[PDB]
Amino acid sequence: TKKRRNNGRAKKGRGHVQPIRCTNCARCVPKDKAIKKFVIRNIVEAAAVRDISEASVFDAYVLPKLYVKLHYCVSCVIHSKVVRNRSREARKDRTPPPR
């Protein structure tokens, strides 16, 4: 029995999609199938923000950000709880989680 109408990927209208590598386990996964997450995070965490700002030499320096695109293979996404399993009806919802 078919589980998903899109077969768990986003390949429509084309034959082949370039392989990419899982950032965790280094697995060859098609780019459309892979689970991608864009992380924008402060280089200095909120715990050390006060210490960094106090020890700075400039005024209103604004700490830099870090931009990383993580690509995960389905197994790693499930194991790392990035994505979860849902009910047969909840699977159809494509709306991103509120967060």
Binding site: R21, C25, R27, C28, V44, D51, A55, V57
Partner: protein, 135 residues
């Protein structure tokens, strides 16, 4: 023991923080980056490969580096942070933040932070196989 600089002015050096998942490098060198002043690693502080990349070893290394640099007359530091890069991970290891905070609390003045990790345009083949690492 160093440059003759007035009290209000601060001497500047750059610090390379290589935060891998095996250990952490704290490497202070000149603004040009050619002459080094202090380079001590997490492995030089903890005698256990487990803790080589721990925040504790990074904290100790940062404190040692900051003390030596203060003894050498540099009061302000330029921070550039690096991960393994290449085809491997791009997120810095756990020691980066601990080292940064440790050298902040050590009286060092902080310049401008930058993220310099090797970002390939399109690299070679990653080490893991087609099925990847299975542990």
């Amino acid at each position: 023991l160093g440059p003759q600089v007035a009290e209000g002015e601060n001497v500047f050096g750059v610090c390379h923080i290589f935060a891998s998942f095996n250990d952490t490098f704290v490497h202070v060198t000149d603004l040009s980056g050619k002459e080094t002043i202090c380079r001590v690693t997490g492995g030089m502080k903890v005698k256990a490969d487990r803790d080589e990349s721990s925040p504790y070893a990074a904290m100790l290394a940062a404190q040692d580096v900051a003390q030596r640099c203060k003894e050498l007359g540099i009061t302000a530091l330029h921070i550039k942070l690096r991960a393994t890069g290449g085809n491997r991970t791009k997120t810095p290891g756990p020691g980066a933040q601990s080292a940064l905070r440790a050298l902040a609390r050590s009286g060092m003045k902080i310049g401008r932070i930058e993220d310099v990790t090797p970002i390939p345009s399109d690299s070679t083949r990653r080490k893991g196989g087609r099925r990847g690492r299975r542990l």
